Structures are given as C-alpha cells and as structure tokens.
Design a protein around this ligand. Structure first.
Ligand code: NI
Length: 252
C-alpha cells in the first residue's frame, strides 16, 4: 500500500480555506445534472476523542441511476454503492471512501491538516517513524502551468491570470510563495492531505494505487486553482452564510 502527502500551499488563511472549500465543492458541482439524487445520509452525529471534536457522517452514493442500464445489470451487487465515512474537526478532517462490493479491499483515505504555514512541517500527521519514511511528499503549486494537463487548462481558472477585486490578491507568479515570506499582510496556509490508496484484489495493487494517486494530484491541482480564482465569490462569506446556502439547497 502506497501513501503520499500532497502539500497544497495557498494564499488564503486557514479560516478562509474552510469557507472557500465548502463554496467550491458546491459551486463546481453546480452544472452537474444528477447531483444530490442518490445521496443517502446513514449517520450524522457529533463526536469527540482526545482533542479531536467534530462531526461524523456516513453517506452512500448510489450510482445505479447514473450509469447505462447494462452497467447496472452487469455490476456485481453493491459495486455501484460508494460509501463515504467522514470525520470533520476542521482544521483536521478524515474521509474514507469504499465500495460496497469491494468491502474494505478497495479504500481511499484522505487525512488533512490545514495549517498556517508554508508546508514546512514534517510528519504533521504523526505517523510511526518507519511508516513515515515511506511517504512521498508531493508539492502542488497552483501558479505553475506545467502542473496542469493541457486538456484541463482553462484561462478563467488560472491563478497566473486572475486578480481579486475584493482582496487584490493575484495574479500569482513563480515567486508568489517567496513574496509570502517577505510579506506581513496576505494570509497563507498549507493543506497537508495524506492520501492512502488500497486495492487488494487481482494483484493490481500497484497499478490502481498509482492511477488513483495521479488522478488525486490532478484533482487537487485543478480544484485549488478553481478555488483561488473564485476568491471574489466566497472570500466575503462566513460559515453561517455557507450553512444557510446548504439549507437553501436542501429544499428541492
Ligand atoms: Ni441506499
């Protein structure tokens, strides 16, 4: 099993990131016809354990209605049931994704620490030493065009081409992180997203784990480029605003 820590350094604050990430999930899913239908909340409850106080959820995403009929007839029982278990104690969060038919043999776990630094901490997740020694650190730089697939590139989601009206932040150049250390004002943080991918069937562990990690890097990159370029849409929201928009979207 292969573990990698993606460090996403961002020119927002931790506080800002919370709001921005919630907004961006909602907003980037706002053109998907077929979103929300088939989502099933099994559990939604508070929890508390040794400093981590938060909200736990257990949700199922039924893909039966979203795939061709022959997929839904050919799929082994439960293979189209995606389980997500989530512990949100922001600035820390853990999510575990499984497949009902794969049981625990196919697993994607993301554990994130959101810290007000430039991604300089080592083993921020406090792994056992030998285990830590086998974790690759992967830096994601949202300004760097060479980290984007050409098919994914969108000028309107390019931090190198965006300046924020409300904050004047951006556009981001290759020295933006350096000018953060030499700055006294603009906030910054780093999301330390430790991703574990497990695929125990058919001796395909290596292939699938590598494919999933590549896709996760691509998604983390595109998502946070979007998140920065939407700064003007969400930087003035509070958490209460976000909860209100959630309830609003709940009516339908
Ligand atoms: Ni169900």
């Amino acid at each position: 099993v292969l573990l990698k820590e993606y460090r996403v350094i961002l020119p927002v604050s931790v506080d800002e990131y919370q709001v921005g990430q919630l907004y961006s999930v909602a907003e980037a899913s706002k053109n998907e016809t077929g979103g929300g239908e088939g989502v099933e909340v099994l559990v939604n409850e508070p929890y508390e354990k040794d400093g981590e106080k938060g909200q736990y959820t257990h949700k199922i995403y039924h893909l039966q209605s979203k795939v061709p009929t022959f997929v839904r007839m050919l799929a082994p029982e439960g293979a189209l049931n995606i389980h997500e278990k989530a512990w949100n104690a922001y600035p820390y969060c853990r999510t575990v994704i499984t497949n009902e038919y794969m049981k625990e043999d196919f697993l994607i776990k993301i554990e994130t620490w959101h810290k007000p630094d430039l991604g300089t901490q080592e083993n921020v997740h406090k792994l056992e030493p030998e285990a830590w020694k086998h974790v690759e650190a992967v830096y994601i730089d949202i300004a760097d065009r060479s980290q984007v697939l050409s098919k994914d590139y969108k000028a309107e989601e390019d931090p190198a081409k965006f300046k924020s009206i409300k904050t004047g932040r951006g556009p981001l150049g290759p020295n933006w992180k350096q000018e953060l250390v030499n700055q006294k004002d603009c906030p910054y943080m780093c999301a330390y997203k430790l991703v574990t991918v497990k695929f125990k069937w058919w001796g395909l562990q290596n292939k699938v784990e590598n494919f999933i990690h590549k896709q996760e890097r691509r998604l983390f990159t595109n998502f946070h480029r979007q998140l920065f370029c939407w700064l003007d849409k969400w930087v003035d929201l509070t958490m209460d605003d976000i909860r209100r928009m959630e309830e609003e979207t709940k009516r339908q």
